[PDB]
Symmetry: C2
Subunit: 180 residues, 2 copies
């Protein structure tokens, strides 16, 4: 059992998202004229949970969009994690120009997925600003990107992988770190 | 005289660049296989100064590239600062793929110029990472960008402008803050 450790149990996930929701409301005037955009399949589901939490706290709906991204690599190396983002498409159901957008990512690692998400946003509109909310920050950035909202920060080596499980995809809520 | 204040005199500029040069060498194995790329006219001149400082400390030359960017705005508002970057072109004289690149900016403000600089880099190659060095960070980010190396951090309001003067452009070395 010693090559996996739980870094967020289901309670901690709920608590972290609830805290992020409150931080969004405090920093962004109750989230009027602010849109959440998920990246990664699990980032999308997290953005939808966050929108529902903000609606319950504030009483007004929050719009959610999605950016569909797959990460590839240029070589045959299985150890190194996928680090070249391909934007498959995007669906943001309202105009973002002059609005605040918050990108929602499950795990902040190299920053490359975020960079492609910002590019996809500025391709469809001219938001007044883009912020970044992440469930876990595991360090090892390869770009000059930082999150505005963080569920939990953990130290990691490059030999490790962080796995997020969500009910919607995986039929359970958990975050764990694994040795590769 | 009370609508301008000097935040870096010529001594402080020299000292800040010398400190950034040492920090680059400590963090990046003496800057072998690391390229500096300036953005903004003054960011280019700063990158060339930094390269010369690293050469003097380490003894090996450092390659400098340039990205040519002009900032525009979509409206007639003179108060708000220019916030839409147009990449006019780039000249990076070596391949950047699998190399470390450091972008050099004079003043970090919204982050939008940096975002266009990263995009221009990933359009011509696949660097192993991109870092960011700035002479001054004046806050008020509009994107989730942070510098890796900072000469000086200052608090500012949106009513203020930061002016960098360099010998190469302005015939003097100074940084000041002004009330708009």
């Amino acid at each position: 059992s010693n090559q996996k450790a739980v870094i967020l149990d289901e309670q901690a996930i709920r608590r972290a998202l609830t805290r992020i929701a409150h931080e969004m409301i405090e920093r962004n005037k109750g989230m009027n004229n602010c849109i959440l955009v998920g990246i990664k399949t699990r980032g999308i589901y997290l953005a939808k949970r966050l929108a529902e939490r903000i609606e319950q706290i504030e009483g007004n709906p929050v719009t959610v969009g999605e950016i569909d991204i797959t990460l590839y690599r240029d070589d045959l190396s299985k150890k190194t994690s996928n680090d070249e983002p391909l934007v498959k498409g995007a669906d943001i159901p309202v105009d973002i120009t002059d609005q605040k957008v918050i990108l929602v990512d499950d795990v902040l690692y190299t920053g490359r997925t975020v960079r492609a998400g910002m590019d996809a946003l500025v391709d469809v509109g001219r938001p007044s600003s883009i912020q970044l909310a992440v469930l876990v920050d595991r360090g090892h950035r390869e770009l000059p990107i930082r999150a505005d909202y963080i569920g939990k920060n953990i130290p990691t080596s490059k030999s490790e992988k962080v796995m997020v499980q969500l009910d919607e995809v995986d039929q359970n809520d958990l975050v764990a770190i694994y040795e590769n």
